[PDB]
Amino acid sequence: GHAPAEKRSTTREGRGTWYDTGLGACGWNNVNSDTVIALSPSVYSGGSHCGQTVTVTNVVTGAKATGTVADECPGCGPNDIDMTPGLFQQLGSLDEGVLTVSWTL
């Protein structure tokens, strides 16, 4: 039913990998060059993570970028997420696959 989820929006380090962006698991459809995010499943994320803006700061190089949760990363926990490759280039390099980024949600 209803659930007024009040998440403590706090900057914390986690993992952030790129995926092939085309159709988000929420009501968004974006290309690879865009800056959107795939967050841990809405079951675990209370539903209210879908459509949230998230600032991600790759701690490896200190590179800060921002992407909006449009998709749901299924096979990952609340310390590891996915994102657009275009955004992941702004965090670091595609060759890394995953990077340790400081995300706030």
TrEMBL record:
Intrachain disulfide bonds: C26-C50, C73-C76
Keywords from the UniProt entry: Signal
Protein name, entry field: RlpA-like protein double-psi beta-barrel domain-containing protein
